[PDB]
Design a protein around this nucleic acid. Structure first.
Length: 156
DNA sequence: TGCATCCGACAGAAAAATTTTCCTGAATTTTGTATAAGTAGCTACAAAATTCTCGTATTAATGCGTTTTTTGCATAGAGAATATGCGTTTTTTGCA
């Protein structure tokens, strides 16, 4: 089921000479045909045209459900670790408190704008006992509450 | 013509009568005899097929020396953690 035999023999299943698997998938006639000769038995259905000529017998067009769906997951990964940020491109959630959400740092908004202008942002609540809970985990993606709490997370 | 009274054992002999059984037509538990038609199969024949075999051709299979690669390897930093630490703090003692 693995990638090379998956993607190789299947898109084979609509073409061969395994020269078709070597292309698109990558597995050459070497590790494809040899491993697929024994694999032709492991899911339990003849995929290509057993050394014949042109066929779609029981390839992977009907095996990808229990097959491709998986490696489509890492196919999204095969694309890239995202485009902006590796994980959760939008990750800038500010604290909800009654002190300083509004007005003390407009040159920081300047630099954020200078490095990246009008960039969408988000928010969470913390508490300050609950800020503690969710910052020693680091929930509050950006977090500000009396430093006398929330102590754990990474880097001590 | 009106007042009482009463009723609704036994024996012999010949004829009949129920079954039984062999003879005699009647036309069945049925089943018997030959001839000619006809119904169904056997011998023969058709061949171009189709398909079995030997040879050649491409192709797919299978092994390897090597590409890069994934995963196990080590030793370098950091970020508090952990003392001293006073220095500050909480503990512990006697008088009214």
């Amino acid at each position: 089921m693995r990638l090379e035999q998956l993607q190789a023999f299947l898109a084979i299943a609509e073409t061969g000479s395994f020269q078709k698997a070597a292309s698109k998938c990558g597995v050459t006639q070497s590790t494809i045909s040899r491993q697929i000769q024994s694999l032709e038995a492991d899911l339990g259905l003849e995929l290509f045209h057993r050394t014949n000529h042109s066929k779609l017998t029981l390839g992977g067009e009907r095996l990808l459900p229990r097959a491709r769906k998986i490696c489509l997951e890492w196919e999204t990964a095969t694309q890239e670790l995202g485009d902006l940020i590796a994980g959760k491109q939008p990750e800038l959630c500010i604290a909800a408190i009654h002190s300083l959400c509004g007005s003390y740092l407009p040159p920081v908004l300047q630099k954020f704008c200078r490095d990246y202008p009008e960039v969408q942002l988000r928010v969470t609540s913390l508490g300050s006992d609950r800020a503690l809970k969710v910052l020693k985990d680091g929930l509050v993606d950006l977090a500000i509450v009396m430093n006398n709490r929330f102590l754990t997370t990474g880097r001590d």
